[PDB]
Structure 1
Amino acid sequence: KQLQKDKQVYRATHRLLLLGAGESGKSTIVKQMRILHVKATKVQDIKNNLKEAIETIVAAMSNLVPPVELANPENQFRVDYILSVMNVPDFDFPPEFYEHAKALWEDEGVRACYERSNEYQLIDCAQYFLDKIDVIKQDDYVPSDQDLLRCRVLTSGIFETKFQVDKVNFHMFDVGGQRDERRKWIQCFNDVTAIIFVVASSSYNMVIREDNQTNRLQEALNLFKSIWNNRWLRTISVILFLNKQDLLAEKVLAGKSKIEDYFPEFARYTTPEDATPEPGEDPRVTRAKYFIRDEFLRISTASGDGRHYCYPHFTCAVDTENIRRVFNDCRDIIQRMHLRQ
């Protein structure tokens, strides 16, 4: 009947449902997983992402309590140049556009705009490619897999991906995080194996693109609260992550944004003794990451009743080694949970 075996190889599979707001890393992490266990427009969209970022800075230049002025106003036409292509559906990306982007990227008024990135919706890998593309200002270059993982693609709809880890089947579903897409996630709520809720750790001082008035982290907190209580979700433990550890660490080292400013619960907060930080790790950063960690744990603490547990870890998506190690640990956890049924 060829079905008596297929249902069991399904039972021999891992369903990995990914959650998290937009730009969290869901696309990033599924890209990572494919590389770790497994046709040219890729190079194109990157520029488009570039084309986005180069706009976002200049657009928001007039959208701050100071109108962000160039240190070199003579390149204002350059600005206007970008404002001339401010909405170009297609774009050949001519080399003069590359020059116009770079020249302002080295401008320090542009630098003052970029440094206040929190006060407006903006991609994360912006400054990275703002220098990486100077290497591919020409056209005969194939970007790095590092750029591939840093490629900003908007997740919209069920993106199923299968693979094998040492004779164990794994089937993850990339799913967007924007508000409208959240009407979809329900479709995947049917007997999924493990529920990877990632959160953009560094997105505590910024607001979501929905209303630009609700803190990205506070938003995701409310989200996770809701889902941790979902009448079909009280029975499967949750694996939690904190993406962009590095970016958060840079936020701390800059000391410009204040978590207590955004969330005063950190001022009166104490570092937990069970902290297992890496060598050469700012203890204040350890304090803050575990602060957020418990802030999410709190929700997984007020309920669950021993039927579904949290296992909060840490993650920097551009660090394939981080991904590998934490994912191996998660593989242990999920291969345990697989038979919990």
Structure 2
Amino acid sequence: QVYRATHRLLLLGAGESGKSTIVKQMRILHVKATKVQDIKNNLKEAIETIVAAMSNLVPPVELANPENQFRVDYILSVMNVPDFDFPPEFYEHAKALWEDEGVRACYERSNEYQLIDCAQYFLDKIDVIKQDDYVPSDQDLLRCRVLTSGIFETKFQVDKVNFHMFDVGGQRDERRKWIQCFNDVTAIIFVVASSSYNMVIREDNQTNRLQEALNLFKSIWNNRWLRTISVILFLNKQDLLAEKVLAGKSKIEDYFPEFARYTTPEDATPEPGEDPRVTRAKYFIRDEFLRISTASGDGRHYCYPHFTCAVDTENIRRVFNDCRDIIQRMHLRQY
């Protein structure tokens, strides 16, 4: 009985797209020692990855300061070892490396390798993290990355209405377990890491990320079990997408040729003073998905897109509240 009365929302999307970051935003709105481990862990992974990559790129990247070489040597030594003790000498080698113009130049070419999203975020606050009395903020916990293996349900009430939300693992190994969640689903929330148009998936290091998303979305929109189900599509990481468009170093055209003839829609509503180039790039990415969503469905289900930033509490509070009504509609449309 309570079963059918529940608003059952299923988060889907590839890996590192923004799924658990959405759940975290839900707990902060409607609902620590291990967490500092995870934050310290992300911090270690960030630096190892950058320094490890310098001598593997083509052309390779060398240190701006030859005298930093011993620090590279340390980082690479303590690479994959058992439960690392995080000595003080770790925090200073990491900081000094991060300030090196060559370590940075390798960071700028990070789409050529597999770097985590929180990388810069955490590297900018090594001095805060290292303190004994350090207590992670709400934002730190949002940025913190922990890969999801398994199915995690999160229950929360909003204006007296109850929601049960399912977070899954995004990578390929995990997609098998998804079918275990298809029962009585009110709405699917599909998340997209929009800024990843110039990157490749971890699984095979060949498949374009944005492409993987488009296919996974195609598979979802046409799934035998989800014919009736409507999809709320978060075109996420708007902040990163913008920055990349404004940096102008990696072009969307090179990865997606069709963008060359693309023109901003007549009904595109840009943010106050938003650069025209951002507008175009963000609406292009949107229209890549709507092509798929309009191809089938026969009016049995619909796609409702939104531009989001999963790490922005006020953004996720706004977009989520603006959906509470259609979700109710969809639930009554199921009865």
TM-score (norm 1): 0.96
Instruction: Verify the 8 A CA contact 1:12 1:168 in the aligned structure 2.
Output: no
CA distance, structure 2, for counterparts of residue 13 and residue 40 of structure 1: 33
Rounded Cα–Cα distance in structure 1 between residues aligned with 2:27 and 2:34: 18
Q: Aligned residue for 1:281? A: 274
Question: Displacement, 1:335?
Answer: 1.1
Q: Deviations over 1:90-137 (max 9, x none)?
A: 011111100000000000100100011111111111111101222122
Q: CA deviation at 1:237?
A: 0.8
Name the CA distance, whole Å, in 1 between partners of 2:284 and 2:129: 40
**How far has the Cα of 1:297 moved from its partner?**
0.6
CA distance in 2, matches of 1:123, 1:261: 23
- Candidates 161, 169, 176, aligned match of 1:168: 161
SS, match of residue 124 in structure 2: helix
1:118-163 deviation line (CA, Å, top 9, x unaligned):
1111111111110122212222210111001111111111111100
Partner of 1:78, secondary structure, is helix
**CA apart distance, 1:183:** 1.1
Report the alpha carbon displacement of residue 174 of structure 1 after superposing the two structures with TM: 1.2
Deviation larger for 9-18 or 316-325 = 9-18
Following superposition, the deviation at residue 12 of structure 1 comes to 2.2
Range that drifts further, 134-143 or 245-254: 134-143
* Matched-pair identity in %: 100
Q: Distance in 1 between matches of 2:50 and 2:296?
A: 43
SS of 1:17's partner is: strand
The whole-number CA distance in structure 1 between the counterparts of 2:295 and 2:254 is 25
Equivalent position SS for 1:31: helix
Alignment check: 8 A CA contact 1:95 1:138 kept: no
Query: Is the partner of 1:136 in helix, strand or coil?
Result: helix
The answer to whether the Cα contact below 8 Å between 1:244 and 1:317 also exists between their aligned partners in 2 is yes
Alignment RMSD (CA, Å): 1.0
Deviation string 1:30-73 (CA, Å, 9 cap, x unpaired) is: 11111111142101111111111111101111121022111012
Counting matched residue pairs gives 334
- The structural deviation recorded for 1:189 is 1.1
Q: Shift in Å at residue 303 of structure 1?
A: 0.8
What SS does the aligned partner of 1:288 have?
helix
Contact 1:53 1:122 survives alignment (8 Å)? yes
Alignment deviations for residues 281-301 of structure 1 (CA, whole Å, 9 cap, x no partner)? 111111111111010010001
Paired with 1:332 and 1:47, the residues of 2 have a C-alpha distance of 40
Contact 2:50-2:103 within 8 A present in 1 as well: yes
Where 1:182 maps in the other structure, the secondary structure is coil
Q: Are the counterparts in 1 of residues 187 and 229 from structure 2 also a CA contact under 8 Å?
A: yes
SS of match in other structure, 1:76: helix
Cα deviation code 1:288-319 (max 9, x no counterpart): 11111010010001111111100010111121
Contact 2:40 2:129 in 1 (8 A): no
Q: List per-residue Cα deviations over 1:231-287 (Å, max 9, x = no partner).
A: 111111111011110000000000011111100111110111111111011111111
Unaligned runs of 5+ in 1: 1-7
Distance of 2:201 and 2:68 partners within structure 1: 32
Does the 8 Å CA contact 2:230/2:301 hold for their aligned counterparts?
Answer: yes
Is structure 2 residue 62 aligned with structure 1 residue 49? no
Q: Where does the alignment leave 5 or more consecutive residues of structure 2 unmatched?
A: none
Range with bigger deviation, 129-138 or 318-327: 129-138
Question: Equivalent residue for 1:15?
Answer: 8
What CA distance in whole angstroms lies between the structure 2 residues aligned with 1:288 and 1:261?
A: 13
Aligned to 2:272, the other structure's residue is in SS state coil
Residue 302 (structure 1) aligns with: 295
Deviates more, 1:317-326 or 1:97-106: 317-326
2:217 and 2:280 map into 1 onto residues whose CA distance is 22
Instruction: Return the offset for 1:20.
Output: 1.1
Task: Please state if 1:68 is matched with 2:61.
Answer: yes
Q: Is the 8 A contact 2:194 2:236 kept in 1?
A: yes
1:204 is paired with a residue whose SS is helix
In structure 2, what is the equivalent of residue 264 of structure 1? 257
Q: Distance in 2 between matches of 1:40 and 1:31?
A: 17
Q: Which of 201, 211, 216 lines up with 2:209 in the alignment?
A: 216
**DSSP 3-state at the match of 1:81:** helix
Q: Cα deviation per residue 1:161-192 (whole Å; 9 max; x = unaligned)?
A: 10000110001111111110011111111111
Relative to the length of structure 2, the TM-score reads 0.98
Distance 1:333 1:62 in 2: 52
Contact residue 158 and residue 174 of structure 1 kept, 8 A: yes
* 1:89 CA displacement: 2.4
Q: How many angstroms apart in 1 are the aligned matches of 2:297 and 2:263?
A: 25
Equivalent in the alignment of 1:254: 247
d(CA) in 2 for partners of 1:52 and 1:220? 25
Corresponding residue for residue 143 of structure 1: 136
* 3-state secondary structure, aligned to 1:311: strand
Contact 2:95 2:126 survives alignment (8 Å): no
Q: CA deviation at 1:27?
A: 1.3
